[PDB]
Protein backbone atom coordinates (compact mmCIF):
# COMPACT_ATOMS: atom_id res chain seq x y z
CA UNK A 1 0.00 0.00 0.00
CA UNK A 2 1.09 3.91 -0.48
CA UNK A 3 0.19 7.35 0.70
CA UNK A 4 -0.28 10.38 -1.02
CA UNK A 5 0.97 13.83 -0.98
CA UNK A 6 -1.60 16.37 -1.83
CA UNK A 7 -0.30 16.61 -5.51
CA UNK A 8 0.60 14.03 -7.58
CA UNK A 9 -0.54 12.34 -10.99
CA UNK A 10 -2.86 9.50 -10.30
CA UNK A 11 -4.69 8.44 -13.23
CA UNK A 12 -6.35 9.63 -16.37
CA UNK A 13 -10.28 10.94 -16.59
CA UNK A 14 -10.69 7.82 -18.86
CA UNK A 15 -8.93 5.20 -16.37
CA UNK A 16 -11.24 6.10 -13.39
CA UNK A 17 -12.72 9.29 -12.14
CA UNK A 18 -12.52 11.54 -9.36
CA UNK A 19 -13.45 10.66 -5.44
CA UNK A 20 -13.37 12.11 -2.40
CA UNK A 21 -10.93 15.19 -1.42
CA UNK A 22 -9.37 15.40 -5.11
CA UNK A 23 -9.36 17.47 -7.78
CA UNK A 24 -8.26 16.94 -11.43
CA UNK A 25 -6.60 19.54 -13.98
CA UNK A 26 -5.79 18.89 -17.86
CA UNK A 27 -6.53 15.11 -18.01
CA UNK A 28 -5.06 13.95 -14.98
CA UNK A 29 -6.35 13.06 -11.34
CA UNK A 30 -4.50 15.10 -8.92
CA UNK A 31 -4.16 14.02 -5.03
CA UNK A 32 -5.58 16.78 -2.25
CA UNK A 33 -4.59 15.18 0.87
CA UNK A 34 -1.71 13.03 2.70
CA UNK A 35 -3.81 9.89 3.38
CA UNK A 36 -3.84 6.37 2.31
CA UNK A 37 -5.06 5.53 -1.29
CA UNK A 38 -8.03 3.59 -1.73
CA UNK A 39 -9.59 2.71 -4.82
CA UNK A 40 -13.64 1.80 -4.36
CA UNK A 41 -14.02 -0.46 -7.15
CA UNK A 42 -17.56 -1.05 -6.26
CA UNK A 43 -19.72 -2.54 -9.42
CA UNK A 44 -19.21 -1.47 -13.58
CA UNK A 45 -15.60 -1.11 -13.40
CA UNK A 46 -13.87 2.30 -13.66
CA UNK A 47 -12.80 2.91 -9.96
CA UNK A 48 -13.67 6.21 -8.12
CA UNK A 49 -9.91 6.83 -6.59
CA UNK A 50 -9.73 8.74 -3.88
CA UNK A 51 -8.03 9.32 -0.86
CA UNK A 52 -8.70 9.47 2.67
CA UNK A 53 -6.57 10.16 5.80
CA UNK A 54 -8.93 7.94 8.05
CA UNK A 55 -7.65 9.54 11.27
CA UNK A 56 -9.64 12.35 11.53
CA UNK A 57 -8.85 15.36 13.99
CA UNK A 58 -11.52 17.76 12.52
CA UNK A 59 -14.09 17.73 10.33
CA UNK A 60 -16.33 20.86 8.95
CA UNK A 61 -19.64 20.45 9.57
CA UNK A 62 -21.91 20.49 6.83
CA UNK A 63 -25.49 20.92 4.80
CA UNK A 64 -26.61 17.90 6.48
CA UNK A 65 -24.90 15.68 8.60
CA UNK A 66 -25.56 13.88 12.11
CA UNK A 67 -23.83 14.97 15.44
CA UNK A 68 -24.18 14.23 19.23
CA UNK A 69 -24.40 17.75 20.68
CA UNK A 70 -24.79 19.20 24.24
CA UNK A 71 -26.92 21.99 25.62
CA UNK A 72 -25.84 24.91 27.34
CA UNK A 73 -28.72 27.20 28.10
CA UNK A 74 -32.55 27.12 27.13
CA UNK A 75 -34.63 29.68 26.22
CA UNK A 76 -38.79 29.90 25.98
CA UNK A 77 -38.09 30.35 22.01
CA UNK A 78 -34.96 28.55 21.25
CA UNK A 79 -32.39 26.53 22.96
CA UNK A 80 -28.23 26.84 22.41
CA UNK A 81 -26.41 23.95 22.36
CA UNK A 82 -22.76 22.87 21.80
CA UNK A 83 -22.43 19.83 19.23
CA UNK A 84 -20.15 17.66 21.06
CA UNK A 85 -19.52 14.90 18.40
CA UNK A 86 -19.97 14.60 14.49
CA UNK A 87 -21.52 10.89 14.39
CA UNK A 88 -19.26 8.83 16.33
CA UNK A 89 -15.98 10.58 16.43
CA UNK A 90 -14.33 13.03 19.54
CA UNK A 91 -14.53 16.58 18.50
CA UNK A 92 -11.18 18.29 19.95
CA UNK A 93 -13.03 21.87 19.77
CA UNK A 94 -16.84 23.16 20.76
CA UNK A 95 -19.01 25.09 17.62
CA UNK A 96 -22.12 26.94 18.89
CA UNK A 97 -25.49 26.41 17.63
CA UNK A 98 -29.20 27.25 18.05
CA UNK A 99 -33.04 25.01 18.06
CA UNK A 100 -35.59 27.37 17.05
CA UNK A 101 -39.06 26.38 17.86
CA UNK A 102 -40.17 24.75 14.84
CA UNK A 103 -37.42 21.49 14.65
CA UNK A 104 -38.85 19.61 18.02
CA UNK A 105 -41.19 17.30 16.81
CA UNK A 106 -41.70 15.82 13.13
CA UNK A 107 -44.56 17.78 12.11
CA UNK A 108 -43.57 20.98 12.85
CA UNK A 109 -46.42 22.13 14.97
CA UNK A 110 -47.78 24.57 17.21
CA UNK A 111 -47.96 24.07 21.06
CA UNK A 112 -44.52 22.15 21.41
CA UNK A 113 -43.30 24.14 24.37
CA UNK A 114 -39.21 24.56 24.43
CA UNK A 115 -38.75 24.37 28.01
CA UNK A 116 -39.71 21.26 29.08
CA UNK A 117 -38.31 19.64 25.77
CA UNK A 118 -34.23 20.44 25.98
CA UNK A 119 -33.36 20.66 29.82
CA UNK A 120 -29.60 21.77 30.37
CA UNK A 121 -26.97 19.61 30.60
CA UNK A 122 -28.37 16.69 28.34
CA UNK A 123 -26.59 15.36 25.73
CA UNK A 124 -28.63 15.23 22.09
CA UNK A 125 -28.70 13.87 18.78
CA UNK A 126 -29.57 16.31 16.10
CA UNK A 127 -29.31 16.91 12.42
CA UNK A 128 -28.62 20.17 10.94
CA UNK A 129 -30.38 21.41 7.93
CA UNK A 130 -28.28 24.85 7.04
CA UNK A 131 -25.36 26.92 7.59
CA UNK A 132 -26.98 29.59 9.25
CA UNK A 133 -26.90 33.21 9.47
CA UNK A 134 -24.12 35.23 12.14
CA UNK A 135 -26.56 35.06 15.05
CA UNK A 136 -27.16 31.09 14.97
CA UNK A 137 -24.91 29.30 12.87
CA UNK A 138 -26.31 26.00 12.26
CA UNK A 139 -29.23 26.07 12.54
CA UNK A 140 -29.78 22.07 13.68
CA UNK A 141 -32.88 20.05 13.48
CA UNK A 142 -34.36 17.13 15.76
CA UNK A 143 -37.38 16.43 13.45
CA UNK A 144 -37.21 13.08 13.25
CA UNK A 145 -37.93 9.69 15.58
CA UNK A 146 -34.13 8.81 16.09
CA UNK A 147 -33.41 12.21 17.23
CA UNK A 148 -33.91 13.93 20.66
CA UNK A 149 -32.08 13.40 23.48
CA UNK A 150 -30.74 10.63 24.45
CA UNK A 151 -28.29 10.51 27.64
CA UNK A 152 -30.50 12.50 30.29
CA UNK A 153 -29.27 13.68 33.78
CA UNK A 154 -31.21 13.31 37.24
CA UNK A 155 -31.78 16.64 39.20
CA UNK A 156 -29.22 15.59 41.55
CA UNK A 157 -26.55 13.72 39.62
CA UNK A 158 -27.71 10.54 38.59
CA UNK A 159 -27.97 8.94 34.93
CA UNK A 160 -31.33 8.70 33.82
CA UNK A 161 -33.05 5.75 31.46
CA UNK A 162 -36.21 6.74 29.06
CA UNK A 163 -39.46 5.70 30.12
CA UNK A 164 -41.82 6.79 27.67
CA UNK A 165 -42.61 8.92 24.53
CA UNK A 166 -43.13 12.72 26.08
CA UNK A 167 -42.73 11.65 30.34
CA UNK A 168 -39.99 10.78 32.17
CA UNK A 169 -39.40 9.67 35.83
CA UNK A 170 -36.59 9.50 38.34
CA UNK A 171 -35.51 5.94 39.42
CA UNK A 172 -34.29 6.93 42.82
CA UNK A 173 -37.18 9.77 44.13
CA UNK A 174 -39.97 8.65 41.28
CA UNK A 175 -40.28 12.10 40.29
CA UNK A 176 -41.58 12.95 36.94
CA UNK A 177 -40.41 15.23 34.01
CA UNK A 178 -40.70 15.93 30.58
CA UNK A 179 -38.21 15.61 27.70
CA UNK A 180 -38.07 14.51 23.76
CA UNK A 181 -36.86 10.38 23.85
CA UNK A 182 -34.98 9.30 20.99
CA UNK A 183 -35.38 6.01 19.64
CA UNK A 184 -32.32 3.48 20.43
CA UNK B 1 -63.89 28.52 -29.66
CA UNK B 2 -62.94 29.08 -25.62
CA UNK B 3 -66.60 27.98 -24.94
CA UNK B 4 -67.93 24.52 -24.61
CA UNK B 5 -71.33 23.81 -23.26
CA UNK B 6 -70.99 20.01 -22.03
CA UNK B 7 -73.85 17.72 -22.67
CA UNK B 8 -76.66 16.96 -19.98
CA UNK B 9 -75.54 13.49 -20.44
CA UNK B 10 -73.51 12.44 -22.96
CA UNK B 11 -69.95 12.98 -21.38
CA UNK B 12 -70.52 10.95 -18.46
CA UNK B 13 -70.05 7.14 -18.61
CA UNK B 14 -67.99 6.17 -15.30
CA UNK B 15 -67.46 7.89 -11.86
CA UNK B 16 -65.71 5.53 -10.19
CA UNK B 17 -63.73 3.84 -12.79
CA UNK B 18 -61.59 7.10 -12.88
CA UNK B 19 -60.32 8.82 -9.97
CA UNK B 20 -59.03 5.62 -8.36
CA UNK B 21 -58.35 7.83 -4.73
CA UNK B 22 -60.93 8.98 -2.84
CA UNK B 23 -62.02 12.36 -2.61
CA UNK B 24 -64.50 14.44 -0.64
CA UNK B 25 -67.20 11.93 0.56
CA UNK B 26 -70.66 13.37 1.33
CA UNK B 27 -73.07 11.03 3.55
CA UNK B 28 -75.73 11.95 0.69
CA UNK B 29 -75.79 10.91 -2.53
CA UNK B 30 -73.89 12.99 -5.72
CA UNK B 31 -76.37 14.12 -8.33
CA UNK B 32 -74.84 13.97 -12.27
CA UNK B 33 -73.86 17.54 -12.43
CA UNK B 34 -71.78 17.89 -9.12
CA UNK B 35 -69.45 15.15 -10.45
CA UNK B 36 -69.48 16.72 -13.78
CA UNK B 37 -68.39 19.40 -12.42
CA UNK B 38 -65.73 17.56 -10.14
CA UNK B 39 -64.63 15.64 -13.20
CA UNK B 40 -63.49 18.78 -14.89
CA UNK B 41 -61.97 20.57 -12.03
CA UNK B 42 -59.63 17.71 -11.11
CA UNK B 43 -57.71 18.47 -14.33
CA UNK B 44 -57.66 22.41 -13.13
CA UNK B 45 -60.20 23.17 -15.65
CA UNK B 46 -62.33 26.78 -15.35
CA UNK B 47 -66.23 25.58 -14.57
CA UNK B 48 -69.39 27.67 -15.09
CA UNK B 49 -72.47 26.28 -13.24
CA UNK B 50 -76.28 27.23 -13.45
CA UNK B 51 -78.39 25.98 -11.66
CA UNK B 52 -81.48 26.34 -9.05
CA UNK B 53 -80.68 24.88 -5.59
CA UNK B 54 -78.33 27.01 -3.65
CA UNK B 55 -75.90 23.79 -1.55
CA UNK B 56 -76.12 22.13 -4.73
CA UNK B 57 -73.53 24.36 -6.48
CA UNK B 58 -71.61 24.47 -3.40
CA UNK B 59 -70.97 20.48 -3.66
CA UNK B 60 -67.79 21.52 -6.05
CA UNK B 61 -67.11 24.72 -4.10
CA UNK B 62 -66.20 22.54 -1.36
CA UNK B 63 -64.07 20.06 -2.83
CA UNK B 64 -62.00 22.83 -4.08
CA UNK B 65 -61.77 23.71 -0.52
CA UNK B 66 -60.83 20.19 0.45
CA UNK B 67 -58.69 19.63 -2.75
CA UNK B 68 -56.64 22.82 -1.39
CA UNK B 69 -55.36 21.80 1.71
CA UNK B 70 -54.24 18.53 -0.30
CA UNK B 71 -52.02 21.07 -2.17
CA UNK B 72 -51.40 23.58 0.83
CA UNK B 73 -52.63 26.28 -1.52
CA UNK B 74 -55.01 29.05 -0.80
CA UNK B 75 -58.31 30.06 -2.13
CA UNK B 76 -60.51 33.24 -2.27
CA UNK B 77 -64.22 32.72 -1.97
CA UNK B 78 -66.45 36.23 -3.05
CA UNK B 79 -69.92 36.70 -1.29
CA UNK B 80 -71.38 39.99 -1.53
CA UNK B 81 -73.41 40.21 1.22
CA UNK B 82 -72.87 40.20 4.83
CA UNK B 83 -75.62 37.49 5.83
CA UNK B 84 -74.47 34.84 3.81
CA UNK B 85 -70.73 35.80 4.27
CA UNK B 86 -70.47 34.31 7.51
CA UNK B 87 -72.73 31.49 6.88
CA UNK B 88 -70.28 29.46 4.79
CA UNK B 89 -67.61 30.23 7.43
CA UNK B 90 -69.09 28.85 10.27
CA UNK B 91 -70.38 25.83 8.13
CA UNK B 92 -66.84 25.41 7.49
CA UNK B 93 -65.53 26.13 10.69
CA UNK B 94 -66.51 23.21 13.03
CA UNK B 95 -66.66 21.16 9.76
CA UNK B 96 -62.65 21.23 9.19
CA UNK B 97 -59.02 23.09 9.42
CA UNK B 98 -59.40 27.12 9.77
CA UNK B 99 -61.12 29.58 7.81
CA UNK C 1 19.78 17.67 -2.98
CA UNK C 2 21.07 15.51 -0.07
CA UNK C 3 19.51 14.93 3.20
CA UNK C 4 21.62 14.79 6.42
CA UNK C 5 21.85 13.22 9.94
CA UNK C 6 20.28 14.61 13.29
CA UNK C 7 21.56 16.10 15.78
CA UNK C 8 21.51 16.02 20.16
CA UNK C 9 18.71 19.51 20.20
CA UNK C 10 16.69 17.66 17.57
CA UNK C 11 16.63 14.00 18.75
CA UNK C 12 15.90 15.13 21.48
CA UNK C 13 12.71 17.51 20.82
CA UNK C 14 11.14 14.36 19.09
CA UNK C 15 10.79 11.90 21.28
CA UNK C 16 7.52 9.82 21.73
CA UNK C 17 5.95 9.27 25.67
CA UNK C 18 4.09 6.56 25.47
CA UNK C 19 2.16 -4.43 36.99
CA UNK C 20 6.13 -5.24 37.64
CA UNK C 21 6.09 -4.74 41.48
CA UNK C 22 5.22 -1.61 43.84
CA UNK C 23 7.60 1.24 44.83
CA UNK C 24 6.52 4.46 45.98
CA UNK C 25 4.66 3.00 49.14
CA UNK C 26 2.91 5.79 51.29
CA UNK C 27 1.33 7.19 47.82
CA UNK C 28 -1.24 3.97 46.93
CA UNK C 29 -5.29 4.21 46.99
CA UNK C 30 -6.46 1.80 50.25
CA UNK C 31 -3.41 3.33 51.87
CA UNK C 32 -4.54 6.75 51.84
CA UNK C 33 -8.38 6.60 52.05
CA UNK C 34 -29.05 0.10 51.17
CA UNK C 35 -30.07 0.74 47.31
CA UNK C 36 -33.68 -0.79 46.49
CA UNK C 37 -33.86 0.41 43.88
CA UNK C 38 -37.82 -0.69 42.26
CA UNK C 39 -36.91 0.05 38.81
CA UNK C 40 -39.24 0.50 36.41
CA UNK C 41 -39.27 -0.93 32.82
CA UNK C 42 -35.38 -0.34 31.56
CA UNK C 43 -36.05 1.03 28.54
CA UNK C 44 -39.32 2.19 26.75
CA UNK C 45 -39.34 0.21 23.50
CA UNK C 46 -41.65 2.64 21.72
CA UNK C 47 -44.02 -0.10 20.24
CA UNK C 48 -46.90 2.51 21.49
CA UNK C 49 -48.30 5.49 19.99
CA UNK C 50 -46.00 7.68 19.09
CA UNK C 51 -48.33 10.84 18.51
CA UNK C 52 -45.83 12.13 14.97
CA UNK C 53 -46.57 9.20 12.66
CA UNK C 54 -49.77 8.79 14.37
CA UNK C 55 -51.48 12.26 13.20
CA UNK C 56 -49.39 11.89 9.79
CA UNK C 57 -50.60 8.38 8.80
CA UNK C 58 -53.74 9.26 10.39
CA UNK C 59 -54.53 12.42 7.78
CA UNK C 60 -52.76 10.79 5.38
CA UNK C 61 -55.05 7.64 4.83
CA UNK C 62 -58.53 9.73 6.27
CA UNK C 63 -58.39 12.28 3.71
CA UNK C 64 -61.52 13.26 4.05
CA UNK C 65 -61.51 16.85 5.60
CA UNK C 66 -65.19 16.50 6.60
CA UNK D 1 -23.42 19.69 67.10
CA UNK D 2 -26.70 21.54 69.60
CA UNK D 3 -29.80 20.48 68.80
CA UNK D 4 -32.75 22.13 67.24
CA UNK D 5 -36.17 23.38 68.80
CA UNK D 6 -33.32 24.41 71.61
CA UNK D 7 -31.52 27.28 69.87
CA UNK D 8 -34.51 29.39 68.09
CA UNK D 9 -34.09 33.00 68.59
CA UNK D 10 -30.16 32.51 68.68
CA UNK D 11 -28.31 34.01 65.96
CA UNK D 12 -26.54 31.40 64.41
CA UNK D 13 -23.47 31.27 61.78
CA UNK D 14 -22.49 29.53 58.40
CA UNK D 15 -20.87 26.57 59.17
CA UNK D 16 -22.62 25.42 62.22
CA UNK D 17 -24.37 22.01 62.59
CA UNK D 18 -27.63 21.65 64.16
CA UNK D 19 -29.52 18.50 65.16
CA UNK D 20 -33.38 17.99 64.00
CA UNK D 21 -35.17 15.65 66.65
CA UNK D 22 -35.46 12.33 66.17
CA UNK D 23 -37.32 8.41 62.79
CA UNK D 24 -36.26 11.00 59.86
CA UNK D 25 -38.82 13.82 59.31
CA UNK D 26 -40.07 15.12 56.02
CA UNK D 27 -39.71 18.28 57.28
CA UNK D 28 -38.09 20.53 54.07
CA UNK D 29 -34.93 22.74 54.62
CA UNK D 30 -35.99 26.90 53.59
CA UNK D 31 -33.64 29.04 52.11
CA UNK D 32 -30.63 29.43 54.58
CA UNK D 33 -30.69 25.63 55.62
CA UNK D 34 -29.35 22.80 53.49
CA UNK D 35 -30.11 19.16 54.83
CA UNK D 36 -27.27 16.67 55.37
CA UNK D 37 -27.90 13.07 56.38
CA UNK D 38 -29.53 13.26 59.03
CA UNK D 39 -28.65 16.58 60.28
CA UNK D 40 -29.23 19.92 59.02
CA UNK D 41 -26.36 22.70 57.69
CA UNK D 42 -26.53 26.56 58.12
CA UNK D 43 -25.32 28.76 55.13
CA UNK D 44 -26.69 31.94 56.12
CA UNK D 45 -26.28 34.34 58.98
CA UNK D 46 -29.82 35.11 60.75
CA UNK D 47 -31.93 33.67 63.51
CA UNK D 48 -33.98 30.37 63.54
CA UNK D 49 -37.59 30.67 63.37
CA UNK D 50 -40.21 27.68 63.68
CA UNK D 51 -43.90 27.97 62.12
CA UNK D 52 -46.46 25.07 62.75
CA UNK D 53 -50.22 26.01 62.53
CA UNK D 54 -52.17 25.50 65.74
CA UNK D 55 -51.81 21.13 65.27
CA UNK D 56 -49.78 18.64 66.33
CA UNK D 57 -48.63 17.71 62.54
CA UNK D 58 -46.68 19.15 60.04
CA UNK D 59 -47.18 22.02 60.00
CA UNK D 60 -43.24 23.37 60.12
CA UNK D 61 -40.96 24.57 58.19
CA UNK D 62 -37.19 25.37 58.94
CA UNK D 63 -35.97 28.94 57.37
CA UNK D 64 -33.50 31.58 59.13
CA UNK D 65 -34.18 34.99 58.39
CA UNK D 66 -31.64 37.66 57.59
CA UNK D 67 -31.07 41.06 56.19
CA UNK D 68 -30.28 41.32 52.10
CA UNK D 69 -30.41 43.68 49.64
CA UNK D 70 -30.03 41.52 46.43
CA UNK D 71 -33.80 39.75 45.56
CA UNK D 72 -33.73 35.97 44.47
CA UNK D 73 -37.14 35.34 43.04
CA UNK D 74 -39.23 33.04 44.62
CA UNK D 75 -42.42 31.58 43.05
CA UNK D 76 -45.57 33.15 44.72
CA UNK D 77 -44.08 36.47 45.79
CA UNK D 78 -45.91 40.08 44.75
CA UNK D 79 -42.66 41.56 42.99
CA UNK D 80 -43.09 45.21 41.23
CA UNK D 81 -41.46 45.08 37.88
CA UNK D 82 -40.01 47.83 35.53
CA UNK D 83 -40.75 47.10 31.43
CA UNK D 84 -37.51 47.51 29.67
CA UNK D 85 -38.22 46.14 25.71
CA UNK D 86 -41.74 45.27 23.25
CA UNK D 87 -39.45 42.83 21.23
CA UNK D 88 -41.71 40.31 19.39
CA UNK D 89 -44.83 39.58 21.22
CA UNK D 90 -44.46 39.98 24.85
CA UNK D 91 -43.35 42.43 28.03
CA UNK D 92 -39.68 41.97 28.71
CA UNK D 93 -39.69 43.46 32.79
CA UNK D 94 -36.89 44.23 35.37
CA UNK D 95 -37.79 42.52 38.80
CA UNK D 96 -34.29 43.11 40.17
CA UNK D 97 -33.21 39.62 40.07
CA UNK D 98 -30.41 38.01 37.40
CA UNK D 99 -32.29 37.81 34.35
CA UNK D 100 -35.36 39.88 32.97
CA UNK D 101 -38.82 38.71 33.24
CA UNK D 102 -41.43 38.07 30.37
CA UNK D 103 -45.22 39.01 30.05
CA UNK D 104 -47.82 38.66 27.16
CA UNK D 105 -49.82 40.75 25.73
CA UNK D 106 -52.90 38.94 26.14
CA UNK D 107 -51.88 38.25 30.44
CA UNK D 108 -53.67 41.28 30.85
CA UNK D 109 -57.50 41.28 31.38
CA UNK D 110 -59.47 41.07 28.80
CA UNK D 111 -56.89 41.26 26.41
CA UNK D 112 -57.15 39.83 22.80
CA UNK D 113 -55.20 40.29 19.57
CA UNK D 114 -57.15 43.30 18.49
CA UNK D 115 -57.53 45.06 21.99
CA UNK D 116 -54.10 44.93 23.35
CA UNK D 117 -52.95 46.96 26.49
CA UNK D 118 -51.19 50.11 26.25
CA UNK D 119 -47.88 49.18 28.01
CA UNK D 120 -45.09 51.62 27.34
CA UNK D 121 -40.94 51.87 28.14
CA UNK D 122 -40.63 52.28 31.88
CA UNK D 123 -43.24 51.44 33.37
CA UNK D 124 -44.07 49.83 36.93
CA UNK D 125 -46.54 46.66 37.06
CA UNK D 126 -48.01 44.98 39.98
CA UNK D 127 -47.95 41.30 39.56
CA UNK D 128 -47.57 37.71 40.85
CA UNK D 129 -45.46 34.92 39.41
CA UNK D 130 -45.96 31.30 38.25
CA UNK D 131 -42.72 30.08 37.48
CA UNK D 132 -39.88 30.91 39.06
CA UNK D 133 -37.63 28.05 39.27
CA UNK D 134 -33.91 28.25 38.61
CA UNK D 135 -34.62 26.83 34.59
CA UNK D 136 -35.98 29.53 32.66
CA UNK D 137 -36.58 33.42 32.47
CA UNK D 138 -39.18 33.63 35.80
CA UNK D 139 -42.56 34.53 34.09
CA UNK D 140 -45.79 36.26 35.91
CA UNK D 141 -48.77 36.74 35.13
CA UNK D 142 -50.99 39.84 35.73
CA UNK D 143 -54.45 39.13 36.71
CA UNK D 144 -55.54 36.66 38.76
CA UNK D 145 -55.72 32.78 39.47
CA UNK D 146 -59.20 32.69 38.21
CA UNK D 147 -58.68 35.99 35.73
CA UNK D 148 -60.06 38.79 37.59
CA UNK D 149 -57.63 41.56 37.92
CA UNK D 150 -57.96 42.29 41.51
CA UNK D 151 -56.47 45.32 41.46
CA UNK D 152 -53.05 44.35 39.31
CA UNK D 153 -51.76 45.61 36.21
CA UNK D 154 -50.48 48.61 35.81
CA UNK D 155 -50.42 50.98 39.01
CA UNK D 156 -49.22 54.27 40.13
CA UNK D 157 -49.96 57.81 38.42
CA UNK D 158 -48.71 60.25 41.18
CA UNK D 159 -46.63 58.48 43.67
CA UNK D 160 -43.29 57.86 45.04
CA UNK D 161 -41.57 54.36 44.28
CA UNK D 162 -38.48 53.98 46.42
CA UNK D 163 -36.49 50.60 47.16
CA UNK D 164 -36.42 49.24 50.85
CA UNK D 165 -34.60 45.76 52.45
CA UNK D 166 -35.77 42.60 52.78
CA UNK D 167 -36.18 43.11 56.04
CA UNK D 168 -38.18 46.40 56.64
CA UNK D 169 -40.95 44.51 53.98
CA UNK D 170 -40.45 41.16 56.20
CA UNK D 171 -41.23 43.04 59.22
CA UNK D 172 -44.31 45.26 57.64
CA UNK D 173 -46.28 42.13 56.20
CA UNK D 174 -46.88 40.75 59.10
CA UNK D 175 -50.50 39.85 61.49
CA UNK D 176 -49.02 41.02 64.22
CA UNK D 177 -47.43 44.52 62.94
CA UNK D 178 -49.09 48.10 63.65
CA UNK D 179 -46.51 49.70 61.84
CA UNK D 180 -48.88 50.64 59.03
CA UNK D 181 -51.73 51.63 61.41
CA UNK D 182 -49.88 54.16 63.36
CA UNK D 183 -47.37 55.96 60.15
CA UNK D 184 -51.18 56.41 58.51
CA UNK D 185 -52.76 57.86 62.07
CA UNK D 186 -50.41 60.35 60.94
CA UNK D 187 -50.21 61.10 57.28
CA UNK D 188 -53.57 59.10 55.70
CA UNK D 189 -51.78 57.19 52.82
CA UNK D 190 -52.05 53.88 50.45
CA UNK D 191 -49.00 51.39 49.71
CA UNK D 192 -48.92 48.49 47.52
CA UNK D 193 -45.34 46.61 48.82
CA UNK D 194 -43.23 44.43 46.84
CA UNK D 195 -40.98 41.60 47.97
CA UNK D 196 -38.45 42.72 45.57
CA UNK D 197 -37.54 45.28 47.84
CA UNK D 198 -39.80 48.09 46.14
CA UNK D 199 -42.42 50.24 47.86
CA UNK D 200 -45.34 52.87 46.03
CA UNK D 201 -46.50 55.54 48.33
CA UNK D 202 -49.16 58.37 47.84
CA UNK D 203 -49.52 60.64 50.71
CA UNK D 204 -51.73 63.85 49.98
CA UNK D 205 -49.45 66.58 50.17
CA UNK D 206 -46.00 66.40 48.36
CA UNK D 207 -43.97 67.69 51.85
CA UNK D 208 -46.40 64.24 53.27
CA UNK D 209 -44.97 62.40 50.51
CA UNK D 210 -41.43 63.44 51.24
CA UNK D 211 -41.52 62.44 54.60
CA UNK D 212 -43.22 58.89 54.46
CA UNK D 213 -40.60 58.09 52.22
CA UNK D 214 -38.01 58.87 54.24
CA UNK D 215 -39.50 57.93 57.67
CA UNK D 216 -40.27 54.33 56.41
CA UNK D 217 -37.06 53.20 55.51
CA UNK D 218 -35.91 53.96 59.09
CA UNK D 219 -38.40 51.54 61.01
CA UNK D 220 -36.97 48.31 60.67
CA UNK D 221 -34.75 49.78 63.44
CA UNK D 222 -35.85 52.31 66.03
CA UNK D 223 -37.88 49.76 68.13
CA UNK D 224 -41.29 50.72 69.38
CA UNK D 225 -42.26 51.73 72.92
CA UNK D 226 -39.36 53.95 74.56
CA UNK D 227 -38.31 55.10 70.80
CA UNK D 228 -41.36 55.17 68.49
CA UNK D 229 -43.91 57.36 70.58
CA UNK D 230 -41.19 60.23 70.97
CA UNK D 231 -39.94 59.98 67.00
CA UNK D 232 -43.68 60.30 66.22
CA UNK D 233 -44.22 63.17 68.50
CA UNK D 234 -41.17 64.55 67.20
CA UNK D 235 -42.33 64.23 63.44
CA UNK D 236 -46.13 65.78 64.25
CA UNK D 237 -44.62 69.18 63.93
CA UNK E 1 -77.33 52.10 17.42
CA UNK E 2 -76.57 49.57 14.75
CA UNK E 3 -74.94 51.98 12.13
CA UNK E 4 -73.11 54.29 14.88
CA UNK E 5 -70.47 51.75 15.08
CA UNK E 6 -70.11 51.13 11.13
CA UNK E 7 -70.00 54.86 10.81
CA UNK E 8 -66.84 55.06 13.42
CA UNK E 9 -65.19 52.13 12.06
CA UNK E 10 -65.68 53.68 8.72
CA UNK E 11 -64.22 57.13 10.60
CA UNK E 12 -61.45 55.42 12.19
CA UNK E 13 -59.87 54.16 9.12
CA UNK E 14 -59.93 57.36 7.41
CA UNK E 15 -58.24 58.69 10.79
CA UNK E 16 -55.59 55.92 10.33
CA UNK E 17 -54.96 56.55 6.60
CA UNK E 18 -54.24 60.24 7.23
CA UNK E 19 -51.51 59.82 9.43
CA UNK E 20 -49.64 58.72 5.71
CA UNK E 21 -50.35 61.91 4.19
CA UNK E 22 -49.15 63.98 7.41
CA UNK E 23 -46.21 61.96 7.67
CA UNK E 24 -45.96 62.40 3.55
CA UNK E 25 -46.05 66.39 3.89
CA UNK E 26 -44.10 66.90 6.98
CA UNK E 27 -46.34 68.30 9.57
CA UNK E 28 -46.78 66.53 12.85
CA UNK E 29 -49.05 69.84 14.40
CA UNK E 30 -51.97 67.95 13.23
CA UNK E 31 -50.51 64.37 12.94
CA UNK E 32 -50.06 64.73 16.82
CA UNK E 33 -53.62 65.60 17.58
CA UNK E 34 -54.99 63.13 15.13
CA UNK E 35 -52.91 59.95 16.63
CA UNK E 36 -54.41 61.18 19.90
CA UNK E 37 -58.27 61.22 18.59
CA UNK E 38 -57.07 57.99 17.04
CA UNK E 39 -56.17 56.33 20.30
CA UNK E 40 -59.19 58.59 21.60
CA UNK E 41 -61.74 56.69 19.16
CA UNK E 42 -61.21 52.58 20.05
CA UNK E 43 -63.19 51.40 22.21
CA UNK E 44 -64.17 48.03 23.13
CA UNK E 45 -67.94 47.26 22.36
CA UNK E 46 -66.51 48.09 18.73
CA UNK E 47 -64.16 45.41 18.86
CA UNK E 48 -67.00 42.71 20.29
CA UNK E 49 -67.85 41.28 17.07
CA UNK E 50 -68.76 37.81 16.96
CA UNK E 51 -69.43 35.09 19.30
CA UNK E 52 -66.53 32.13 18.72
CA UNK E 53 -63.74 35.44 18.22
CA UNK E 54 -61.13 33.35 20.29
Redesign the interface.
Known amino acids: VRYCIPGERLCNLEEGSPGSGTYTRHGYIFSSLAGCLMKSSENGALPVVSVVRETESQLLPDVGAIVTCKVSSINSRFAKVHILYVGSMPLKNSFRGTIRKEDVRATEKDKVEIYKSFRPGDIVLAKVISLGDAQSNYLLTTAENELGVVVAHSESGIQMVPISWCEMQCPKTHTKEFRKVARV | QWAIPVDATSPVGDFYRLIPQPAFQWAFEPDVFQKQAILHLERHDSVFVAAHTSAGKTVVAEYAIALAQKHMTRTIYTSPIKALSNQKFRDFRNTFGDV | ALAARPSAFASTLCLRYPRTLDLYKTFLYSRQVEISPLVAITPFDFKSASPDDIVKANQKKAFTRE | ARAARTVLGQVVLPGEELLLPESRVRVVCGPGLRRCGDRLLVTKCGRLRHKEPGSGSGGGVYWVDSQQKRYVPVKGDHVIGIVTAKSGDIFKVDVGGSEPASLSYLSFEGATKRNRPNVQVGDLIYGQFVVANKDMEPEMVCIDSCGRANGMGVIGQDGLLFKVTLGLIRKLLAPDCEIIQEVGKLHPLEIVFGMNGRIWVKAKTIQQTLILANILEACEHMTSDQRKQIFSRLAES | EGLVVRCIQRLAEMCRSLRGAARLVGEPVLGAKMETAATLL?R?IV?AA?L???
Do not use: C, E, I
Open positions: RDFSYTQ
